[PDB]
């Protein structure tokens, strides 16, 4: 079968270039750790408005001042 | 006694057929192509990613107003 990938590429190298780009396209999102950053960037882009909550017992975290060390880690993008 | 053909001075010109100048072929091409194309996508992810950062700043000025 190892000649079939070289004795049709002497006759029609047209669709062979298509399968070579059809392949190596489905394969790569299962490979590089650059993906799931593509979902991590896409999650912390605020469209709507952040409504606040109310104190009742808890008090889990995040007081009235926003610039306190209160919220989660989305500040790795400015270092990126 | 005034007739044409010279005693000497001739060429001739060829009957030949040749201009096969190569040409940068045969794994030299398909190597400058991919090497140029990967420089393109490497020049992406430094602009498209960076524009995505200024994008959030553009939404930022919206949210700090509208109460
Ligand atoms: C089939 C596996 C697909 C997934 C492979 C994963 C990637 C692998 C990387 C490429 C490896 C080599 C691929 C083998 C190609 C063998 C096909 C072949 O020889 O063609 C025979 C025959 C050739 O018969 P033919 O004699 O008439 O040749 C005419 C070919 N043209 C038209 C180009 C002049 O081709 C076919 O039967 C299929 C043609 C339809 C192809 C539709 C393209 C799909 C578009 C992208 C999706």
UniProtKB/Swiss-Prot annotation, chain A:
A cellular component annotation (GO) from this entry: respiratory chain complex I
Organism domain of life: Eukaryota
Pfam entry (one): NADHdh_A3
Transmembrane segments: 14-34
Homology family: Belongs to the complex I NDUFA3 subunit family.
Assembly description: Complex I is composed of 45 different subunits.
Protein name: NADH dehydrogenase [ubiquinone] 1 alpha subcomplex subunit 3
Organism for this UniProt entry: Bos taurus
Gene that produces this protein: NDUFA3
From Swiss-Prot, chain B:
Compartments reported by the entry: Mitochondrion inner membrane; Nucleus
Source domain of life: Eukaryota
Residues passing through the membrane, by range: 24-45
Protein family per UniProt: Belongs to the complex I NDUFA13 subunit family.
Job of this protein: Accessory subunit of the mitochondrial membrane respiratory chain NADH dehydrogenase (Complex I), that is believed not to be involved in catalysis. Complex I functions in the transfer of electrons from NADH to the respiratory chain. The immediate electron acceptor for the enzyme is believed to be ubiquinone. Involved in the interferon/all-trans-retinoic acid (IFN/RA) induced cell death. This apoptotic activity is inhibited by interaction with viral IRF1. Prevents the transactivation of STAT3 target genes.
Quaternary structure, from the entry: Complex I is composed of 45 different subunits. Interacts with CARD15, but not with CARD4. Interacts with STAT3, but not with STAT1, STAT2 and STAT5A. Interacts with OLFM4.
Protein's recorded name: NADH dehydrogenase [ubiquinone] 1 alpha subcomplex subunit 13
Annotated source species: Bos taurus
